[PDB]
Amino acid sequence: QENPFIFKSNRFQTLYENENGHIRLLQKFDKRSKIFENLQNYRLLEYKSKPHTLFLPQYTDADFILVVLSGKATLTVLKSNDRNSFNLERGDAIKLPAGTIAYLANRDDNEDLRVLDLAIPVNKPGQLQSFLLSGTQNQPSLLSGFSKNILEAAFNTNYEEIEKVLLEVIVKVSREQIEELSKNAKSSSSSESGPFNLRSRNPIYSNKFGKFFEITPEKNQQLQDLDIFVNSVDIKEGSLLLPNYNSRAIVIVTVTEGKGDFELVGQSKQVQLYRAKLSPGDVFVIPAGHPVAINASSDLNLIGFGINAENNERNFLAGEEDNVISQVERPVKELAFPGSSHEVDRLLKNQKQSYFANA
Amino acid sequence: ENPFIFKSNRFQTLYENENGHIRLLQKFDKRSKIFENLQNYRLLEYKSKPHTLFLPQYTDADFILVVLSGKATLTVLKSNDRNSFNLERGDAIKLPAGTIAYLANRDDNEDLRVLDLAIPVNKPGQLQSFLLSGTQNQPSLLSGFSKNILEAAFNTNYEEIEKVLLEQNVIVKVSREQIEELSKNAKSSSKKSVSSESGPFNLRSRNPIYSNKFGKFFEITPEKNQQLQDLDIFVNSVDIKEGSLLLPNYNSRAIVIVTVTEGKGDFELVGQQVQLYRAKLSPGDVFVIPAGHPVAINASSDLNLIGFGINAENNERNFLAGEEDNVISQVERPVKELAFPGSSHEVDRLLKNQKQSYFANA
Amino acid sequence: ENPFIFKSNRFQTLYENENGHIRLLQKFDKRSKIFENLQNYRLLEYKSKPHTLFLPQYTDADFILVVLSGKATLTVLKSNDRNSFNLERGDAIKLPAGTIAYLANRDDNEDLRVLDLAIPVNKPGQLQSFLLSGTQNQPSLLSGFSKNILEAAFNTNYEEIEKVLLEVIVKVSREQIEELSKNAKSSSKVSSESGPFNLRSRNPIYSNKFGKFFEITPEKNQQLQDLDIFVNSVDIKEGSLLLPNYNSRAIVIVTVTEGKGDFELVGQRKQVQLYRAKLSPGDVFVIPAGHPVAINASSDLNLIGFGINAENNERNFLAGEEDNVISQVERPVKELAFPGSSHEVDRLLKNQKQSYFANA
């Protein structure tokens, strides 16, 4: 309430859970505050599964982006006349078009699987609508939805046999089954259909204090259609991502591992700062323009989805490179700041670092 | 408490006279907050009797006309030009907001019927017409302007502007002499205007996507016509023969406003926490298939449907029955065994039972 | 009674000193539900006295500047670059939201008038400004950070940061102004991807003895394309008149720059309604798509239109020789549509011999 921007790991409602994993949905952005009126049509989700488990055939009414935080996975993606399976490592992300049926296996025999989904509902702003093939209990099948009558006309079978075979959740699969599910899969390496790794192209910001990898529409067609960019950022224990703002981009920053705090600058003439402590599970939101600083307690990693990516431009307010402040003319530097121009131009050359520094 | 069926009843008569009708379907978001994303789509029927003309008029809304039946001459004006078009069943053309046009039923015996997808430009889901044609209990758009502008404007005294243009019917009886003159020169549609950027296109002047002994599914994506590319709409025409079935299928991302042209039948829609929404279908009736919702449609008599599909680009339709595009029968052997009670072998055999595709016997 | 005219005084003042000001016309949509689709567009006027300088700032809205009068030096910053532009009457430049820039009146006598169409990126109709300008009346955006981030970020003791950076329009010297003039490119001819374009560079779409109508569009210029906007500068001669015309699909935000005159708009509410208002420098009005509009001029009258939903717009006239859409109606239909005769209608339409603008 003292801060609207920081959605705590608790504020994730839990959709479904079993002895094999859970799908948890974040709090609807525009509810927390009227101020996030534009993110009303974007949802976050966390898929987590123990080893040798299977999220069964399912589709929804939302364009998905899955960003494999940790673990090894086999995502099998059904078209109507084709099917294509993919092995997924950390930093692999792929777009799941609304309507697409697909299932997710954790292939690692020890490691937990952890997947961060950005969802865009296409039917009503911010409402997700899932149709399970696995007509389990309490919830019957999407096929249960039809009538004995129609199900017969269609499948060309007595209802007794359909009811038996088809109608009568994340389940447990045998070690041998995951071999089969896998053996055939394609791997990442900016493709179309296949998955692509956030990190498998040089980072845009790299130094002794952190890494900044980021895939934009100008660099991946999957992302173009939705106008999003997906980024991963490492800030090494006891350091700093330097003050910066995104020209036009709104970020959903999520925390995969580490601890730390962020400082956001916001609000007429009443610039107010927004602090919060960061832990795994936690989200915050960087509305375009609002500048932000990120400090790491332990080894902190972040996963951000920028909305309105196309032509976004991230300007820093400190360090050597991309310090827009230092682009100001000397005479104008004089007026803007109490200090003299040779007194500004020297304090800006005090940080020899760029993008990241020390606490 | 089925929000998806808009029975004919839900049409409001914008205008009626001895010569024709113009109906406007209920705002979709007025039915239910399910349809907040059909907010800015309106449907209208246009029916007019032989040898009648909807006089010049434009509207602050992009229109996609589909002639359902009868024979029309559609004249379209531009700031500086004019082009005539004779239209039959299945002929579809986009008329952009501001486009002055007029539409006469050139057939002698038969009525003319037309389904219109209106996309208002100025204020969500609210169209406004402008008439050149004027009366007295409805002065024309030019009546709008003051004397002082009308005289400056037209460089005529009010006495004659009033007499010649304004005063002393938005659908009027017209002669044979007149309707032949309107139609002379005017162009038809073809195959090499099934992707035309200008003229009308026929839904059926290229082969259907799905077709067997029980039904026919014609569909024009934006891919196959630039006119539908601006508004990201698709228009399909679907015939389901008496005692047959449009097999269970969903759209991946496209919302569809379905209208009934001729025939009777009924639909079953799976929604939400899982729910069957059904109802009988008669001509005039409209229902909505939300993206991802598996729909089935069943015909009692020879049935014809006109869908417009909002969010058309990248829309895959994935069927749940029969050989072809049956997504269920693409699940890796063992997952079928885990997903469905059945053995993988039992799943595979049942899916093979229906050897038909897209449409089937009921 | 007429919700279309926004009198000059519906402009709220965001800031004002003895050097310039910044006004922000009230929300179109707060005026009326009628203008819902304009909810996300804001109008601003920047005025500034000679030898002044709106300090470095950025805003969460795409800015389309039209310079109404004055001379100026709009200086634009990227993360790692600076280009500056000498601007004059007609010069329009787009600033992406998140661009830091600073504008200066480089004239010694005439004030600087800019008309901004602002498009918030964050929350519909909501300008968040971010003053890099460090005072107490408006504490620098840098203020917001805690001593600790600040000391680490610049790697400097806090007492050299309070001192130097923290502790909006301002006066400036001739040698200072001459500085910003020294190496600063101009407009000319447009389609130049990132410079300024003059609204009167290309020839006017309509021009005669009674007015000029200049209009750049997404077609003619990539910068407009993105925001799908057109930008026109209509001139109308004293005792002359822009003949009744409607835009097919374009919602125009018309802003009277100088002169006086009146607009007739034809909306509804048996249906057709004449919406009227006298016009004067600062007055704004809205012309919804499809709504016919004539503009009279009491005195020589310039207008700056921001076309919204610009691509594929066709403006149709309803009087005069050219682009007159009524004269395209077939002869037997004129007979029918109008109470008079094919022939009588043909004559009345041939009576106005001028096109676009005419005498009153």
TrEMBL record, chain A:
Xref: SMART domains: Cupin_1
- Keywords, comma-separated and alphabetical: Vacuole
Q: Where is the composition biased (Low complexity)?
A: 184-193
**Which InterPro entries did the record assign?**
Cupin_1, RmlC-like_jellyroll, RmlC_Cupin_sf, Seed_Storage-Functional
> Which cellular compartments is it found in?
Vacuole, Aleurone grain
Q: SUPFAM superfamilies recorded for this chain?
A: RmlC-like cupins (SSF51182)
Annotated segments matching region Disordered: 182-197
Tell me which stretches of the chain form a coiled coil: none
Q: State where it is primarily located.
A: other
Q: Which residues form the Cupin type-1 domain?
A: 5-163, 196-345
Cellular component GO terms held in the UniProt record: aleurone grain
Has keyword Cytoplasm? no
General function of this protein: Seed storage protein.
Family, similarity comment: Belongs to the 7S seed storage protein family.
PANTHER family noted in UniProt? OS03G0336100 PROTEIN-RELATED (PTHR31189), VICILIN C72 (PTHR31189:SF41)
Tell me what this protein is called: Vicilin
